[PDB]
Amino acid sequence: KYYTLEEIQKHKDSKSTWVILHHKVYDLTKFLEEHPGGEEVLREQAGGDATENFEDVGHSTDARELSKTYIIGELHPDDRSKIA
Ligand code: HEM
Incomplete structure (x- = not known):
């Protein structure tokens, strides 16, 4: 399903914390608490083109x-042409 940068940008944090990862929207409004690096890193890239600051972060394939x-x-x- 498609979403616009508007809705994405709203959904930064607290009950709606979405990320554009490799041209794919995941909500992660829970995983904030769970990630070993906690909220900060997610939050600051949430409602954002996190694609890059996700996979370039030296993430393991896992x-x-x-x-x-x-x-x-x-x-x-x-x-689709903003994420770049
Ligand atoms: C999709 C859910 C994600 C999972 C399950 C996940 C999982 C992990 C795991 C397993 C590590 C530890 C790697 C190791 O110890 O070798 C890690 C590190 C890290 N992750 Fe994620 N991650 C996710 C999303 C994100 C997102 C969206 C961001 C922010 C853009 C992020 C930023 C980071 C950073 C900064 C580190 C390492 C920081 C440091 O070395 O102190 N992660 N992640």
Whole structure:
């Protein structure tokens, strides 16, 4: 399902904490508490083009593979050229 940067940007933190990861929207409004690096790193990239600051962070493949378990959406076919 598509989502626009607007809705994404709203959903930073507290009960709606979404991330655009490799052109794929995951909500992670819970995992905030769970991540070994806690909220901060998620929060600061939430409602954002986290694609990059996610996979470039030296994440182990593991942290990527679970990523494709969730998927609430992809994105609008315009925002597709912002993530870059
Ligand atoms: C999809 C859910 C994610 C999972 C399950 C996950 C899992 C992990 C794991 C297992 C590590 C530790 C790697 C190790 O000890 O070798 C890690 C490290 C890290 N993650 Fe994530 N991660 C997720 C999402 C994110 C996101 C979205 C960000 C922010 C953009 C992020 C930022 C970081 C950072 C900064 C570190 C390392 C910091 C340091 O070395 O002190 N993670 N993650």
